[PDB]
Amino acid sequence: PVEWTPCRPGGALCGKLAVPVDYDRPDGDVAALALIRFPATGDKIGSLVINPGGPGESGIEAALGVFQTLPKRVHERFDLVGFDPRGVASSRPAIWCNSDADNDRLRAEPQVDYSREGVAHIENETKQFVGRCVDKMGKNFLAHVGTVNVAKDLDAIRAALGDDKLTYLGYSYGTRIGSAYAEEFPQRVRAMILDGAVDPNADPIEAELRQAKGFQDAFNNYAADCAKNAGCPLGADPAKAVEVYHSLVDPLVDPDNPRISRPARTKDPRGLSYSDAIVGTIMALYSPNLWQHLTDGLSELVDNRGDTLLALADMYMRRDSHGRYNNSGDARVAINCVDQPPVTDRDKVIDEDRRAREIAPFMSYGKFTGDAPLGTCAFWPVPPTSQPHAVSAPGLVPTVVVSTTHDPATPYKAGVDLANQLRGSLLTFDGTQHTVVFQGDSCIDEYVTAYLIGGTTPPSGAKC
Numbered sequence: 087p088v089e090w091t092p093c094r095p096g097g098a099l100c101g102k103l104a105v106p107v108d109y110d111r112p113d114g115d116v117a118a119l120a121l122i123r124f125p126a127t128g129d130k131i132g133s134l135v136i137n138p139g140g141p142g143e144s145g146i147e148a149a150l151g152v153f154q155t156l157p158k159r160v161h162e163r164f165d166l167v168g169f170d171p172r173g174v175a176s177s178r179p180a181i182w183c184n185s186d187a188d189n190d191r192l193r194a195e196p197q198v199d200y201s202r203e204g205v206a207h208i209e210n211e212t213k214q215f216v217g218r219c220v221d222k223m224g225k226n227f228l229a230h231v232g233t234v235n236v237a238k239d240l241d242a243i244r245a246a247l248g249d250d251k252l253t254y255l256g257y258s259y260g261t262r263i264g265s266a267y268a269e270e271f272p273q274r275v276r277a278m279i280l281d282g283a284v285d286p287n288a289d290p291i292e293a294e295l296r297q298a299k300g301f302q303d304a305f306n307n308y309a310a311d312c313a314k315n316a317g318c319p320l321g322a323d324p325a326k327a328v329e330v331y332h333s334l335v336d337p338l339v340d341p342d343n344p345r346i347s348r349p350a351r352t353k354d355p356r357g358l359s360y361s362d363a364i365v366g367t368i369m370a371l372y373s374p375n376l377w378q379h380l381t382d383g384l385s386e387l388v389d390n391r392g393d394t395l396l397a398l399a400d401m402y403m404r405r406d407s408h409g410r411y412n413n414s415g416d417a418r419v420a421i422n423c424v425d426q427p428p429v430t431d432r433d434k435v436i437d438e439d440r441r442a443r444e445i446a447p448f449m450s451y452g453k454f455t456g457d458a459p460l461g462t463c464a465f466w467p468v469p470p471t472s473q474p475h476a477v478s479a480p481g482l483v484p485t486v487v488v489s490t491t492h493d494p495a496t497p498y499k500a501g502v503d504l505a506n507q508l509r510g511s512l513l514t515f516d517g518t519q520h521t522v523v524f525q526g527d528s529c530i531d532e533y534v535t536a537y538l539i540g541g542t543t544p545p546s547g548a549k550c
């Protein structure tokens with residue numbers, strides 16, 4: 087049973103859910119899932135459940151940003167409910183590998199040197215890092231944190247809500263969650279919308295290169311706008327932009343020792359590492375809302391300051407004013423590694439490097455060494471709980487996949503194939519943002535509410 091308690095931002099409820107760690111072993115140890123219920127304001131059909139994806143994103147978090155941008159009529163007919171998944175912030179037990187020192191220390195480095203020693207150093211630190219987890223977390227737990235178990239929890243959630251079928255909205259990784267449960271309880275699904283799609287069938291390397299081109303495309307599109315604007319810090323020449331970009335970012339690195347960071351002055355005591363110069367960029371590429379923020383931090387670097395770019399990185403890392411991180415960084419990795427088998431082969435990583443440098447030159451520093459470090463998950467001790475495959479969910483309600491044309495994170499073609507793999511209705515947004523639902527856009531939310539209450543899918547090839 088769910089005892090709902092107040093907490094402090096709306097008309098919101100709070101609870102926790104007992105779920106087992108191993109569903110094979112449902113008698114040993116139990117998680118407690120953070121929960122938040124926003125009641126409906128009219129006649130209700132049920133609870134809509136959202137998830138921001140990540141993985142790592144607090145469903146308690148998103149559900150408040152969403153609350154402000156929630157259609158009048160949706161609010162009326164649904165309990166908006168959000169939740170931290172198993173290990174997420176309030177959700178106990180939470181995942182902890184790195185300390186704050188651990189993180190700041192890492193981000194103090196430029197991470198560009200792929201010489202053998204430079205590759206040697208990274209994975210050494212990858213190594214010491216993995217031990218922290220198991221030291222502080224117990225290897226047993228880390229196996230069962232795959233989305234495979236998350237789906238079973240999501241099912242237990244619906245039951246806890248008195249819904250008989252589920253109403254769901256998933257962002258980014260949330261879509262990989264959606265598909266899981268979809269393959270799992272296709273009958274326990276009332277309606278479903280997925281935004282920023284993730285394709286389980288895809289090869290994990292090709293995917294990352296899709297994301298590379300996806301961000302360079304976004305970069306092309308930012309600089310094309312800025313270069314029309316007055317005083318573009320990348321010049322008004324969008325061609326030469328990446329160059330100017332590099333002219334602004336390369337000196338954050340000593341051109342004679344690639345381990346030495348020469349960080350830009352900031353009021354904040356940290357200055358700006360090359361690593362973080364790049365992270366803030368990716369940040370602002372996620373949505374055009376953050377592009378002025380970009381134009382700022384660049385003009386900063388022009389004058390040698392990095393304060394803006396420094397804040398974007400934090401927003402990506404979710405490192406608060408007081409310097410505390412939330413565990414979303416740690417969480418991200420743990421789940422990735424169980425969710426699918428890592429790339430064990432060295433050659434193929436080194437080659438992915440070689441290619442990606444060409445595919446996304448603004449991100450890649452200086453010269454291709456001939457070497458790249460293996461991914462973090464290639465060290466993972468608990469095995470992938472889940473397998474890359476095409477989705478097989480046959481008797482499922484028509485749903486709405488949504489992908490933005492120039493989405494840099496989850497590329498548009500991801501939404502394409504996922505929809506195909508679901509035989510469902512697709513919704514296209516012309517834009518260079520990741521996600522878009524309930525973010526000020528009248529058109530999308532019409533269709534969404536239509537499919538939501540009304541259950542009405544967009545036409546064949548609807549485009550807003």
Ligand SMILES: *[C@](O)(C(=O)OC)[C@H](CC(C)C)NC(=O)[C@H](CCCCN)NC(=O)[C@H](Cc1ccccc1)NC(O)O
Nearest residue numbers: 138139140141257258259260297368402403414495496
């Ligand atoms: C999605 O779940 C989302 O937008 O959540 C914020 C999305 C799902 C796929 C991975 C796109 N996740 C992200 O975009 C995630 C951001 C989470 C930040 C909160 N602390 N970022 C990534 O997965 C990294 C994006 C990226 C890709 C290429 C180059 C640089 C950065 N992926 C890297 O870890 O590879």
